């Protein structure tokens, strides 16, 4: 087989694409994978079979997937994954102790940890408003929670010697047509001001705001819109986090990256396949994923774009969702590394649209597979479909016994 | 007129004061664009007949339309509308002297002027790049044209004692998939920086940037994107101009006003009807326009939102196009002012989504016509359809003879 790799490399090398430099480079990009795929977003507070229902089930499940995904990565956690020890602990009261085990496990595995406060599935979120709720006592609870979550993020970064991204997503909005779009937004601004009042060293923690266009039950209006967070983050030196499923029909995260890189040091990204609404299907190796990777790489933004997954498909093997999802994004970055950017750029500069079109096109049939397979061999994860066998045995022996 | 009086009582029962609304309405200026009158030809060195051919014709046509539009408004001029007395003047050499006849006309009619540099239909725009052209000599030339345009808007403001909005819209982009989305944008940023270097008093001039998603010739990519402009304008304390035809399918300006007023002092808005692309059909009294009006009125923003028209329809009478469109945005403002905000606000704060919905819906049949008709008589413009006569007469007696 390995001649295929040698032969593949001379094809890319005829363009001066150094595949050895690309693999060296790819090796180091971490992808933050999301814990909630493992237990259908259950968490530990107070239809496909085999989910995790237990911290020790979830960590094992994560290990299984990680061992099938080449490289070294991070795990992205939600506050409701706190380990309380059988004590009822309220969300405004969560503390570094409540994530001690996660941090120990991450250290053990060489992982980073990213965090999120949870502002859904909760008594105090029942009216569909949280940070932007009319009642001052509700807003304050959620504020205290977010502040607690930042503290927990600071804890992660200090402990793991890699900054944690603490991302705020709120569900706040209305099912139907609002009579006031201004007042809830105003309240959101005021809540976020208070959440970010205390400074945290950015070696330990970075904050992100995540917009959404609509959700089920928040259909006609959501408070934390794209224009809102884009202005807020820029005003207050915060990261925007972009979810490829959180935008308009035909709306493109690839088109935004480059523009944001001009005005923001760093940018955060959640990848998820939306199908007609924000369905959070599993990421696929598709045109827009390739296009994103091209922007990341082309723009020399590998350390500037913090790449994460977010999807929850309960219709298939969940270890498999993780392994497919993450291998696709890696494959896309690899493909983007294997593009002749200099010639493509020069062609664009000189108005040679004919060649720019032609080669972009011709590169879609370059031996990507052979480069992808060799990289899997060296990074000790199974090649091509062989990772399926590993999942089948773990389904039989572990998942199907639960 | 007793008809008016019964209507005033239906509204007054919610505590809406029609006389107060009418007096606020009378105050609001709408910026009417000159280029509808000559089909965007300008005066630089099949369809409906009798378009303006010369500035005197164009001014007559505008006077006519204005005579049918209730209130006191403004005219938005494009640089190609310079009067250069038979001389060729390059766009970078344009001075206030080339607009004194417009300013003398404006002053004599009590009109404000708004302005735009002209960055299209020119030898130096043939590649479909302008401020973002790879060639430094091209960029520099258009930079100079924009600077010179800011001085002209300054002239306007000094002269008319209302500040001029000088808006930048550029056609820059690529037909097909670009291989570099960042560098043209870095260039656009740099150009703009230069354009805005010289300070000018906000009493005389305000600058705005207009994002588009896409046009003919530029389908895949537009340098001056929404995200780009939003950040630019925020960092550099400049205005955003939103064009209701410049966005995604299902994407609304009405959902953005509230977010932007939370971070920008002032906003500009062009209204036009997009039919499936940025087609610039004549504005109609529709759902989104009403919803735009609602946002402006209920967010207290009648002095914060600079409202203008942008549309070029050649299939119908051009004076009618202005009178329909401006009459529609004024009609929509009136509509908004006659909505019981206080109660609807309070109901949302309360959770009474049933009354919010019911009542917004019942107001759809309130006697708007009777108020609108009274208004038009008070303001000395024909009522209902009767302005068609003046148009028919004008067409026979003037536009036939052209």
UniProtKB/Swiss-Prot annotation, chain A:
The cofactor named in the record is: Mn(2+)
- Catalytic activity reported: L-rhamnopyranose = L-rhamnulose
Residues bound to Mn(2+): 246, 278, 280
Coiled coil residues, start to end: none
The principal location of this protein is: cytoplasm
Gene Ontology biological process terms, A to Z: L-lyxose metabolic process; rhamnose catabolic process
Q: Where in the cell is it found?
A: Cytoplasm
> Which keywords, in A-to-Z order, does the entry hold?
Cytoplasm, Isomerase, Manganese, Metal-binding, Rhamnose metabolism
- Textual note on the cofactor: Binds 1 Mn(2+) ion per subunit.
> Which pathway does it serve?
Carbohydrate degradation; L-rhamnose degradation; glycerone phosphate from L-rhamnose: step 1/3
Report whether Repeat shows up as a keyword of the record: no
Q: Which GO terms describe its cellular component?
A: cytoplasm
Q: What does this protein do?
A: Catalyzes the interconversion of L-rhamnose and L-rhamnulose.
- Database matches in NCBIfam families: PRK01076.1 (NF002203), rhaA (TIGR01748)
Its family? Belongs to the rhamnose isomerase family.
Q: What protein does this entry describe?
A: L-rhamnose isomerase
Q: Which organism is it from?
A: Halalkalibacterium halodurans (strain ATCC BAA-125 / DSM 18197 / FERM 7344 / JCM 9153 / C-125)
């Amino acid at each position: 087989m390995k001649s295929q790799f040698e032969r593949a490399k001379i094809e890319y090398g005829q363009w001066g694409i150094d595949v050895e430099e690309a693999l060296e480079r790819l090796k180091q990009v971490p992808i933050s994978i999301h814990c909630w795929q493992g237990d259908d977003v259950g968490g530990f507070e107070l239809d496909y079979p085999g989910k995790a229902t237990t911290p020790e089930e979830l960590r094992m499940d994560l290990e299984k997937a990680l061992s099938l995904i080449p490289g070294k990565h991070r795990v992205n956690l939600h506050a409701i994954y706190a380990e309380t020890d059988g004590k009822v602990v309220e969300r405004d009261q969560l503390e570094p102790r409540h994530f001690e085990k996660w941090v120990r496990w991450a250290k053990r595995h060489g992982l980073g940890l990213d965090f999120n406060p949870t502002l859904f599935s909760h008594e105090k979120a029942k009216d569909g408003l949280t940070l932007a709720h009319p009642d001052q006592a509700i807003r304050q609870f959620w504020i205290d929670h977010c502040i607690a979550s930042r503290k927990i993020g600071e804890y992660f970064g200090k402990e793991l010697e890699t900054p944690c991204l603490t991302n705020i997503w709120i569900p706040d909005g209305y099912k139907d047509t609002p009579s006031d779009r201004l007042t809830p937004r105003k309240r959101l601004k005021e809540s976020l001001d208070q959440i970010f009042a205390a400074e945290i060293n950015e070696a330990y923690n970075l904050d992100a705001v995540e917009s959404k266009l609509f959700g089920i039950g928040s259909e006609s209006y959501v408070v934390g819109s794209h224009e809102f967070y884009l202005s807020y983050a820029l005003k207050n030196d915060k990261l925007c986090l972009l979810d490829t499923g959180h935008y308009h029909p035909t709306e493109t995260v690839s088109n935004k990256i480059s523009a944001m890189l001009l005005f923001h040091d760093k940018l955060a990204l959640h990848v998820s396949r939306p199908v007609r609404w924000d369905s959070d299907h599993v990421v696929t190796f598709d045109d827009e994923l390739r296009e994103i990777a091209l922007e990341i790489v082309r723009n020399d933004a590998l350390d500037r774009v913090l790449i994460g997954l977010d999807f929850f498909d309960a219709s298939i093997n969940r270890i498999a969702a993780w392994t497919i999802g993450t291998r696709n994004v890696i494959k896309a970055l690899l493909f983007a590394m294997l593009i002749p950017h200099k010639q493509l750029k020069e062609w664009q500069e000189t108005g040679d649209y004919t060649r720019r079109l032609a080669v972009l096109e011709e590169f879609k049939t370059y031996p990507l597979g052979a480069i992808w397979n060799e990289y899997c061999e060296r990074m000790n994860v199974p090649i091509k479909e062989e990772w399926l066998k590993e999942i089948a045995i773990y389904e039989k022996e572990v998942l199907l016994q639960r």
